[PDB]
Amino acid sequence: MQLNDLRSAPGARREKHRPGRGIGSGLGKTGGRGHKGLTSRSGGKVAP
RNA sequence: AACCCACUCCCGUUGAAAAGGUAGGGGAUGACUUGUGGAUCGGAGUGAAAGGCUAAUCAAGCUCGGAGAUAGCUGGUUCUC
Ligand SMILES: [Mg+2]
Ligand SMILES: [Mg+2]
Ligand SMILES: [Mg+2]
Ligand SMILES: [Mg+2]
Ligand SMILES: [Mg+2]
Ligand SMILES: [Mg+2]
Ligand SMILES: [Mg+2]
Ligand SMILES: [Mg+2]
Ligand SMILES: [Mg+2]
Ligand SMILES: [Mg+2]
Ligand SMILES: [Mg+2]
Ligand SMILES: [Mg+2]
Ligand SMILES: [Mg+2]
Ligand SMILES: [Mg+2]
Ligand SMILES: [Mg+2]
Ligand SMILES: [Mg+2]
Ligand SMILES: [Mg+2]
Ligand SMILES: [Mg+2]
Ligand SMILES: [Mg+2]
Ligand SMILES: [Mg+2]
């Protein structure tokens, strides 16, 4: 039990995904928003 | 003639010049031209009226704030399997 020897259980922590970083990441360019439209823009939210 | 203007042609258009020049042209004692100082201004002023002019900016000047106004619209969005 050292400070450089303890970690969390598998699956307890994930990494978050970052849109707009290259092609190989799978979330590049549009970043999961599809193409043009209201719900592809900054503040483009449909009211409840 | 000076002075004030700006009708025509040409040149110039990266100009000598962000509106000129050479030739010609109109008024030239008058509703004339001009120096100095002053007054009126932003939905306001001034206008022998062209929506003209208010510092090369005018169907509502410039500047700083509300303010990162709003943009169902264009553009862009970065390593790997
Ligand atoms: Mg994909
Ligand atoms: Mg998605
Ligand atoms: Mg696009
Ligand atoms: Mg579409
Ligand atoms: Mg869509
Ligand atoms: Mg926005
Ligand atoms: Mg003179
Ligand atoms: Mg001639
Ligand atoms: Mg002349
Ligand atoms: Mg003369
Ligand atoms: Mg006469
Ligand atoms: Mg006088
Ligand atoms: Mg005043
Ligand atoms: Mg105004
Ligand atoms: Mg008219
Ligand atoms: Mg000024
Ligand atoms: Mg002016
Ligand atoms: Mg506000
Ligand atoms: Mg903006
Ligand atoms: Mg296009």
Short mmCIF file of N, CA and C (backbone and C1' of nucleotides) in Angstrom, two decimals, chain B residues 48-80:
data_model
loop_
_atom_site.label_atom_id
_atom_site.label_comp_id
_atom_site.label_asym_id
_atom_site.label_seq_id
_atom_site.Cartn_x
_atom_site.Cartn_y
_atom_site.Cartn_z
P A B 48 -33.27 78.58 -47.85
"O5'" A B 48 -33.72 78.87 -49.35
"C5'" A B 48 -34.79 78.16 -49.94
"C4'" A B 48 -34.86 78.39 -51.43
"C3'" A B 48 -33.72 77.80 -52.25
"O3'" A B 48 -33.95 76.44 -52.56
"C1'" A B 48 -34.14 80.04 -52.92
P A B 49 -32.75 75.38 -52.59
"O5'" A B 49 -33.47 73.98 -52.35
"C5'" A B 49 -33.51 72.98 -53.36
"C4'" A B 49 -34.48 71.88 -53.00
"C3'" A B 49 -35.87 72.02 -53.61
"O3'" A B 49 -36.44 70.72 -53.80
"C1'" A B 49 -36.03 72.10 -51.26
P A B 50 -36.26 69.95 -55.19
"O5'" A B 50 -34.75 69.46 -55.16
"C5'" A B 50 -34.23 68.63 -56.18
"C4'" A B 50 -33.07 67.81 -55.67
"C3'" A B 50 -33.38 66.90 -54.50
"O3'" A B 50 -34.04 65.71 -54.88
"C1'" A B 50 -31.38 68.07 -54.07
P G B 51 -35.32 65.22 -54.06
"O5'" G B 51 -34.90 65.45 -52.56
"C5'" G B 51 -34.86 64.36 -51.67
"C4'" G B 51 -33.69 64.45 -50.73
"C3'" G B 51 -32.93 63.15 -50.58
"O3'" G B 51 -31.98 62.95 -51.63
"C1'" G B 51 -33.63 63.88 -48.45
P G B 52 -30.38 63.01 -51.46
"O5'" G B 52 -30.05 64.49 -50.98
"C5'" G B 52 -28.76 64.80 -50.47
"C4'" G B 52 -28.45 66.27 -50.49
"C3'" G B 52 -27.48 66.74 -49.43
"O3'" G B 52 -26.13 66.46 -49.74
"C1'" G B 52 -29.30 68.24 -49.56
P C B 53 -25.25 65.56 -48.75
"O5'" C B 53 -24.81 66.56 -47.60
"C5'" C B 53 -24.02 67.70 -47.90
"C4'" C B 53 -24.03 68.71 -46.78
"C3'" C B 53 -23.74 68.18 -45.39
"O3'" C B 53 -22.37 67.92 -45.15
"C1'" C B 53 -25.56 69.65 -45.29
P U B 54 -21.95 66.75 -44.13
"O5'" U B 54 -22.26 67.36 -42.70
"C5'" U B 54 -21.65 68.57 -42.27
"C4'" U B 54 -22.19 69.02 -40.94
"C3'" U B 54 -22.10 68.02 -39.81
"O3'" U B 54 -20.82 67.96 -39.23
"C1'" U B 54 -24.23 69.05 -39.80
P A B 55 -20.05 66.56 -39.10
"O5'" A B 55 -18.58 66.89 -39.62
"C5'" A B 55 -18.25 66.88 -41.00
"C4'" A B 55 -16.76 66.91 -41.20
"C3'" A B 55 -16.00 65.72 -40.61
"O3'" A B 55 -14.84 65.47 -41.40
"C1'" A B 55 -15.29 67.70 -39.55
P A B 56 -14.67 64.07 -42.17
"O5'" A B 56 -15.42 64.31 -43.55
"C5'" A B 56 -14.78 64.99 -44.62
"C4'" A B 56 -14.93 64.24 -45.91
"C3'" A B 56 -15.40 62.80 -45.75
"O3'" A B 56 -16.20 62.42 -46.87
"C1'" A B 56 -13.22 62.83 -46.68
P U B 57 -17.80 62.52 -46.79
"O5'" U B 57 -18.20 61.52 -45.62
"C5'" U B 57 -18.54 60.16 -45.89
"C4'" U B 57 -19.18 59.48 -44.70
"C3'" U B 57 -20.57 59.96 -44.30
"O3'" U B 57 -21.59 59.42 -45.12
"C1'" U B 57 -19.21 59.56 -42.38
P C B 58 -22.34 60.33 -46.20
"O5'" C B 58 -23.85 60.33 -45.71
"C5'" C B 58 -24.49 59.14 -45.28
"C4'" C B 58 -25.80 59.42 -44.57
"C3'" C B 58 -26.70 60.44 -45.26
"O3'" C B 58 -28.07 60.08 -45.06
"C1'" C B 58 -26.19 61.18 -43.08
P A B 59 -28.96 59.56 -46.29
"O5'" A B 59 -30.33 59.10 -45.61
"C5'" A B 59 -30.96 59.91 -44.63
"C4'" A B 59 -32.13 59.20 -43.99
"C3'" A B 59 -31.99 57.69 -43.85
"O3'" A B 59 -32.60 57.27 -42.63
"C1'" A B 59 -33.91 58.19 -45.12
P A B 60 -31.79 56.37 -41.59
"O5'" A B 60 -31.18 57.42 -40.57
"C5'" A B 60 -29.97 58.11 -40.84
"C4'" A B 60 -29.68 59.15 -39.80
"C3'" A B 60 -29.58 58.63 -38.37
"O3'" A B 60 -28.63 59.40 -37.64
"C1'" A B 60 -31.38 60.16 -38.52
P G B 61 -27.41 58.67 -36.88
"O5'" G B 61 -26.18 59.65 -37.11
"C5'" G B 61 -25.45 59.63 -38.33
"C4'" G B 61 -24.22 60.49 -38.24
"C3'" G B 61 -23.11 59.96 -37.35
"O3'" G B 61 -22.29 59.01 -38.01
"C1'" G B 61 -23.49 62.24 -36.87
P C B 62 -21.90 57.63 -37.29
"O5'" C B 62 -20.74 58.03 -36.28
"C5'" C B 62 -19.52 58.58 -36.74
"C4'" C B 62 -18.78 59.29 -35.64
"C3'" C B 62 -18.46 58.44 -34.41
"O3'" C B 62 -17.29 57.67 -34.59
"C1'" C B 62 -19.37 60.52 -33.73
P U B 63 -17.13 56.24 -33.87
"O5'" U B 63 -17.06 56.59 -32.32
"C5'" U B 63 -15.93 57.26 -31.77
"C4'" U B 63 -16.15 57.59 -30.32
"C3'" U B 63 -16.55 56.44 -29.42
"O3'" U B 63 -15.45 55.65 -29.02
"C1'" U B 63 -17.93 58.31 -28.98
P C B 64 -15.60 54.06 -28.89
"O5'" C B 64 -16.06 53.85 -27.38
"C5'" C B 64 -15.35 54.44 -26.31
"C4'" C B 64 -16.24 54.67 -25.11
"C3'" C B 64 -17.05 53.49 -24.64
"O3'" C B 64 -16.29 52.56 -23.88
"C1'" C B 64 -18.42 55.40 -24.70
P G B 65 -16.87 51.10 -23.57
"O5'" G B 65 -17.87 51.35 -22.36
"C5'" G B 65 -18.79 50.35 -21.95
"C4'" G B 65 -20.01 50.95 -21.31
"C3'" G B 65 -21.24 50.05 -21.28
"O3'" G B 65 -21.22 49.16 -20.19
"C1'" G B 65 -21.84 52.20 -22.07
P G B 66 -21.44 47.59 -20.42
"O5'" G B 66 -23.02 47.45 -20.61
"C5'" G B 66 -23.91 47.80 -19.56
"C4'" G B 66 -25.35 47.66 -19.99
"C3'" G B 66 -25.70 46.41 -20.77
"O3'" G B 66 -25.88 45.28 -19.93
"C1'" G B 66 -26.66 48.29 -21.83
P A B 67 -25.58 43.79 -20.46
"O5'" A B 67 -24.20 43.93 -21.25
"C5'" A B 67 -23.47 42.77 -21.66
"C4'" A B 67 -22.61 43.04 -22.88
"C3'" A B 67 -21.78 44.32 -22.83
"O3'" A B 67 -20.60 44.13 -23.61
"C1'" A B 67 -23.28 44.42 -24.64
P G B 68 -19.45 43.10 -23.16
"O5'" G B 68 -19.67 41.83 -24.10
"C5'" G B 68 -19.63 41.96 -25.52
"C4'" G B 68 -20.29 40.80 -26.22
"C3'" G B 68 -21.73 40.53 -25.83
"O3'" G B 68 -22.44 40.00 -26.95
"C1'" G B 68 -20.42 38.63 -25.32
P A B 69 -22.96 40.97 -28.13
"O5'" A B 69 -24.51 41.14 -27.83
"C5'" A B 69 -25.00 41.43 -26.53
"C4'" A B 69 -26.49 41.29 -26.50
"C3'" A B 69 -27.04 40.21 -27.41
"O3'" A B 69 -26.88 38.89 -26.88
"C1'" A B 69 -28.17 42.21 -27.86
P U B 70 -28.09 37.87 -26.60
"O5'" U B 70 -28.82 37.70 -28.00
"C5'" U B 70 -30.16 37.23 -28.05
"C4'" U B 70 -30.75 37.38 -29.42
"C3'" U B 70 -30.21 36.45 -30.49
"O3'" U B 70 -30.75 35.14 -30.40
"C1'" U B 70 -30.36 38.63 -31.36
P A B 71 -29.82 33.87 -30.65
"O5'" A B 71 -29.61 33.86 -32.23
"C5'" A B 71 -30.72 33.87 -33.10
"C4'" A B 71 -30.31 34.15 -34.53
"C3'" A B 71 -29.25 33.24 -35.12
"O3'" A B 71 -29.80 32.01 -35.56
"C1'" A B 71 -28.86 35.51 -35.73
P G B 72 -29.50 30.64 -34.77
"O5'" G B 72 -30.29 29.54 -35.60
"C5'" G B 72 -31.71 29.52 -35.62
"C4'" G B 72 -32.28 28.47 -36.53
"C3'" G B 72 -32.27 28.81 -38.02
"O3'" G B 72 -32.20 27.61 -38.78
"C1'" G B 72 -34.51 28.63 -37.27
P C B 73 -30.99 27.37 -39.82
"O5'" C B 73 -30.60 28.83 -40.31
"C5'" C B 73 -31.13 29.38 -41.50
"C4'" C B 73 -30.13 30.29 -42.17
"C3'" C B 73 -28.77 29.68 -42.44
"O3'" C B 73 -28.77 28.90 -43.61
"C1'" C B 73 -28.50 31.81 -41.46
P U B 74 -27.60 27.83 -43.85
"O5'" U B 74 -26.52 28.64 -44.68
"C5'" U B 74 -25.19 28.17 -44.77
"C4'" U B 74 -24.21 29.27 -45.07
"C3'" U B 74 -22.76 28.93 -44.75
"O3'" U B 74 -22.15 28.12 -45.74
"C1'" U B 74 -23.26 31.06 -43.89
P G B 75 -21.42 26.77 -45.31
"O5'" G B 75 -20.06 27.26 -44.64
"C5'" G B 75 -19.18 28.13 -45.33
"C4'" G B 75 -18.15 28.72 -44.40
"C3'" G B 75 -17.38 27.75 -43.52
"O3'" G B 75 -16.33 27.09 -44.21
"C1'" G B 75 -18.09 29.58 -42.22
P G B 76 -16.04 25.53 -43.95
"O5'" G B 76 -15.31 25.50 -42.54
"C5'" G B 76 -14.04 26.12 -42.37
"C4'" G B 76 -13.68 26.25 -40.91
"C3'" G B 76 -13.59 24.97 -40.11
"O3'" G B 76 -12.37 24.27 -40.30
"C1'" G B 76 -14.79 26.59 -38.87
P U B 77 -12.32 22.68 -40.16
"O5'" U B 77 -12.52 22.42 -38.61
"C5'" U B 77 -11.53 22.79 -37.67
"C4'" U B 77 -12.04 22.63 -36.26
"C3'" U B 77 -12.52 21.24 -35.88
"O3'" U B 77 -11.47 20.36 -35.53
"C1'" U B 77 -14.11 22.85 -35.19
P U B 78 -11.32 18.94 -36.27
"O5'" U B 78 -9.78 18.58 -36.07
"C5'" U B 78 -8.76 19.34 -36.69
"C4'" U B 78 -7.47 19.32 -35.90
"C3'" U B 78 -7.29 18.11 -34.99
"O3'" U B 78 -5.91 17.72 -34.97
"C1'" U B 78 -7.18 20.08 -33.71
P C B 79 -5.36 16.61 -35.98
"O5'" C B 79 -5.70 15.22 -35.27
"C5'" C B 79 -5.53 15.06 -33.88
"C4'" C B 79 -4.58 13.93 -33.55
"C3'" C B 79 -5.07 12.52 -33.88
"O3'" C B 79 -4.89 12.17 -35.24
"C1'" C B 79 -4.22 12.56 -31.68
P U B 80 -5.86 11.09 -35.92
"O5'" U B 80 -5.51 9.71 -35.20
"C5'" U B 80 -4.27 9.06 -35.44
"C4'" U B 80 -4.17 7.75 -34.71
"C3'" U B 80 -5.21 6.70 -35.04
"O3'" U B 80 -4.95 6.01 -36.25
"C1'" U B 80 -4.91 6.80 -32.70
#
